[PDB]
């Protein structure tokens, strides 16, 4: 074209980018980066900020999950798949918030918050690492185990150099496709050398031993890229204006006067301000009274400068810079800045919904992914175990129908009410005008619906039973 | 790109050396937590968000409502039902017992153990509670729990960390703990400290040591507050808070001066009034307009000063905006401000705050509140105070997580406007989208007992004959 | 008259070369596509665009209807009824396989596909998707598809571009592609690379290789990326943003200036507090005022400085305003900022907006989805998981595209108010104006599987007998 | 000349890629449908017929 | 002599020079008003209304 | 226009000393802890 060459007169003549893959372009100083993000989100308070509601509104408090086995395709009648999948639904339910703690080898987390973490995690590190263990322990009626694991642990081992087929401690083969990583062992004190151990990506029988998830942006990107990348020297610099700016009002607020007198410290102080009368340098205190006029003999004057406005134009710059650094992390600026100032109703709306729909989005292809991938690991031992009746006349095993078997969908916190009255006004004329069911409007407000009518039934049952009053829901 | 050396140079030497959570936090945890209690004690915005914390995440009640798996185990509800309402109403006696004896200090209620656990967990990273079995007979449950300060769990005799000894926490291979170094009290200084090791989990199964927080990554073994994003401006803002307070008082303090070469006292009596006609130079009474007659030479200037606030108003928005983004408080909150707002603006602020509160309530109160349920419902069980179904085909051991599953109610968001929220609870009702439990939950009721109640209160309107209520037939 | 030269002169010396655009654009290809690469890595505005691009022009989700043409080929309607139906389970079962492994890389899955594709497309110009049949039987179907980047189609060893041969594109005398010679992995660069050549289509019909992008006129090979016109205006917003960081930084940094003839260290020690009781100078502890007593030929000035946004923000506004009016996304959509705002502009520039994604959206996803079902439907077909009917008048090949029409349906315009929107929907359904197939896929859903779901619902709520919904009888 | 630069400014100018850009979404949109009403009529062929065809 | 955009530079000018960044003037110093009346009185000698015109 | 706010925020602030420019940036700005022009 016109722009691509050299640019109006000259212009960005120099600027030359050199044109590789995004591995090339990443792998480097990939270390760097993570290092870099982390310090950001670590001691920010928007970047901690992004990150925080990036976890409570991808998935919120809870993570519900439903299980829809695919019965047609399964040539399954429907009766014995709901049958089926409620059992496993329990099962689920019990084994996830157990208060155990066991799903997890640390013992210090729970599955929601297993998700929070991973959903972080790919955050800022645009990564997630899942590692499942079966626990050889008979203590527990469910082996199995997930370890959350730090991409910071996963590295080429021993440091050395990066192969055709071996990237970053990742072992691909000639499609690219991962089949094992290579893990080191926590270093912590940097005393200790730290060790390598293999992982294969899939357990023989087909079980996932490990778990990477990742949002790729082109082929052959075998390590994904953190969100920050784009604003990360954005961020830091606001950071120094915010530090630098501070300690300027600072000192220019601390010089309050000046004193001009040509006689010694001492009498020019006690003569022009007061302290003195001493009991037995550090000049001398002045005690705060009031009014105090001077006196003074030519010669002699007392200043006191008006220093400057400790917010020439800061304020809006520093709104600008928030502006950009949203725009880059994919938040509503008023969320990451806590500024909801001038804004109207329809507004408001507009910018709730972009950053929704964003987050929707994103727990649909990263924290679904991970839960389903956990959950399909899960189910495997416990299929194999036989605590769950799987249909007699099922036309394929669990093994060759993993993805048929555990079709699943994970329900979040909902888009929580902006107006309140409005959208349950809208949900009601929905479900009056039948265009939508009540399993859409119940995942909207977070719920299911098939516990939310055995609740309704079971209150009517209470209700008559005191004899108090028949609910909107009879006969 | 971005992260290799940034342009022109700029951040050519910001390198972090990347490493574990731990690797950043245990070399420092000590001083960060004293920070951090200094800020929390001597900040008026601190303090405030603590208080909004304790407030929200919890409130003035946290009610239990218990749900065992009667499903898992084949019992039937109606069994099962009464086994919950008969815990339910021994764990309602056992928490509110005004003499405090669920706690050994003997100097709260399980609600004020629930906000300090949280408050203690927000400003300090963590919390840590203790079970103990007392040997006193005269109580029902002999079970206490005691809450102890991150500051007293650390490495024995200040040993330096290892792999397995953290910050005086015993980590196994796979990382879980398995016991803490706890040291008593140092006030006063003069006597030595001594540790004691408490095992994570009593040989038994039931829980001794419960140790509450949440992870950013593997291999963590102590939380950070969430003072640590926000607490270098906080201090900056309190310094700049004081200096300026300081400078207004001085520019305030030195109103006219007088310049003349004749004496001072003589300047006093013919300039300012003066009393010396009848150490401290001269006080002046306050009268009149006293106009003087300075001579050829003397001068009287009155100081025209500066504004007080010179924009620092506009700072303090800025850097409190900050703050309230560190903590996830919303700012109108944090610094009570509330100029320029419409109503969809405050509700969408008080959304996402209320958001945040339910996330905290559910990842930080409801572990803990569940952890002491489970403490307390061993020795129940134990003590054959509450008798299980024979029906049962687990034991308690087996399925404590399903015979101890149970939720937790707290205060409920009590709403901007309250009509509109009412509204839309009772046409949620009537839709049958929303059942009656969440709408109590909501508002932070239960609803077994608004129906007993309801009960009550029409067969006593009946017994009275004045108007059978709005629920009859 | 305005072609010629302008008035006074003007532009005397603007005489832009008249070229077919595959002239202006293949010389400097490359080079366009990395500067592209460096905005859409670096710049946040940039990640925010094409993030936009990702989230509106698919979403979520990418959900298939097939609708066959049973009246060309003389079908039944309740058996193309019966075959698309079965067709559609088979492909939404094959689609969202958790296996991942729709693709060879095993990372991504079909809706992922459609966003890769999208996003690449819009900042690179075109998408590749290489069909490969796989060898092993392990599974129902043994295709998968690689999405090769733009930047891996170039000629073999960087020979100079012929007539029938330009930037790795094999071309027909016609101007039709044949094949395409795409490259290995390039990374690291001490193994060279080398080249194979794909043919476009598979002598039996198969599509191997789909190269997707929409043309400005004839004779295009290669599509240029929407940053073309912008770029430029981009990278230098962003050197004004940090050149102006910069400048605020260096200005707010120095805050006073001391004068004096004395010896430095003492004139710190004198004016400015300092510690020399105790080579970094020497700091300053931060206290109350510190009032000085500056001698006879000092000074202690402090320095005014500038506003720090001394129109730069209005002047941000104006050059946003200009590169979204480039990539056609909504200024505050880019920007973020939201003031100033009304129902009916916000609704306007919405619908600007979502007209152009709906626009991309049908050239781009769309095309490409529908390669990709044709693609596997072959497979499916050949394979006999479905059953062609007996009455089909045109053999699979023949009528490739009437059996595999179908449409998609991307994530749904959800609505600034919705309730407006929902009642519109009603009284258009009401009204005749439209059916329960459109609004349905207009928010996002199908209307089959809502009725059997409804159906479903009531079948369910009769069942425990609650109340029948609305929709009975 | 005057054509080659109408290209140069479509090409390097964000608002007249943008003006060209609404005219190719706004004069067509996204699908051009097509109505076939034959004048039968003046054809003098049975409606019913035509509207077969 | 061309210069490189890198950021803020502060020189060393010694005595007898100086840099000096000219603040130029307003580009729109009431041309717009100007156009208003200009195009009102065109869109009156048109017949058409002056908002269809400007 | 761009290009003259590019050139009229990046010089900010000016020295006015008559050392040479090492000594006048060191005492003035700071810099100088050179490991071994460029200024």
């Not at 200790?192 to 052959?220: C, N, Y």
């Not at 953190?226 to 020297?233: P, Q």
């Not at 006349?393 to 993993?402: D, L």
């Not at 265009?435 to 909207?444: D, F, G, Q, R, V």
């Amino acid at each position: 074209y016109h722009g691509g060459g050299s640019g109006f007169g000259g212009q960005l003549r120099s600027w030359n980018p050199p044109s590789e893959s995004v591995d090339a372009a990443l792998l480097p100083n990939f270390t760097r980066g993570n290092a870099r993000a982390d310090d950001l989100v670590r001691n920010n308070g928007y970047a901690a900020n992004a990150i925080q509601l990036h976890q409570d509104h991808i998935v919120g408090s809870f993570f519900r999950l439903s299980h829809r086995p695919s019965w047609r395709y399964l040539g399954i009648g429907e009766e014995e798949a709901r049958a089926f999948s409620r059992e496993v639904e329990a099962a689920w339910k019990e084994f996830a918030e157990d208060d155990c703690c066991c799903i997890d080898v640390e013992r210090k987390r729970t599955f929601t918050m297993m998700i929070r973490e991973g959903v972080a995690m790919h955050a800022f590190n645009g990564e997630l690492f899942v590692q499942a263990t079966w626990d050889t322990s008979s203590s527990r009626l469910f082996r199995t185990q997930f370890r959350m694991v730090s991409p910071k642990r996963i590295s080429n081992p021993n440091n050395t150099g990066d192969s055709r087929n071996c990237r970053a401690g990742v072992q691909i083969n000639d499609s690219g496709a991962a089949l094992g990583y290579y893990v080191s062992e926590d270093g912590y004190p940097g005393w200790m050398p730290q060790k390598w151990t293999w992982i294969p990506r899939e357990l023989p029988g087909g079980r996932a031993s490990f778990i990477h998830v990742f949002e790729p942006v082109e082929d052959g990107q075998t390590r994904g890229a953190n969100v920050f990348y784009s604003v990360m020297e954005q961020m830091k610099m606001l950071d120094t204006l915010q530090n630098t700016q501070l300690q300027s009002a600072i000192v220019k607020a601390m010089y309050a006067a000046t004193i001009e007198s040509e006689l010694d410290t001492q009498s020019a102080m006690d003569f022009i301000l007061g302290a003195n009368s001493q009991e037995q340098y550090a000049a001398a205190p002045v005690r705060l009274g009031g009014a105090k006029v001077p006196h003074l003999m030519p010669g002699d004057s007392l200043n006191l400068q008006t220093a400057q406005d400790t917010d020439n134009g800061y304020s809006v710059f520093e709104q600008s810079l928030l502006r950009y650094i949203a725009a880059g992390l994919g938040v509503s600026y008023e969320q990451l800045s806590r500024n909801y100032a001038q804004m109207s109703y329809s507004t408001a709306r507009a910018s709730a919904n972009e950053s929704w729909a964003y987050f929707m989005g994103r727990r649909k292809f990263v924290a679904s992914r991970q839960a389903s991938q956990m959950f399909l690991c899960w189910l495997e031992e416990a299929i194999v175990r036989r605590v769950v009746t799987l249909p007699s006349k099922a036309r394929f095993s669990f093994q060759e129908a993993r993805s048929a078997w555990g079709n699943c969908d994970w329900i979040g916190s909902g888009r929580m009410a902006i107006d309140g009255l409005k959208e349950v006004q809208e949900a009601v004329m929905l479900i009056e005008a039948g265009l939508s069911t009540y399993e859409k409007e119940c995942a909207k407000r977070g719920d299911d619906y098939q516990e939310i009518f055995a609740q309704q039934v079971r209150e009517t049952m209470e209700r008559r039973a005191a004899g108090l009053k028949p609910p909107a829901w009879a006969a």
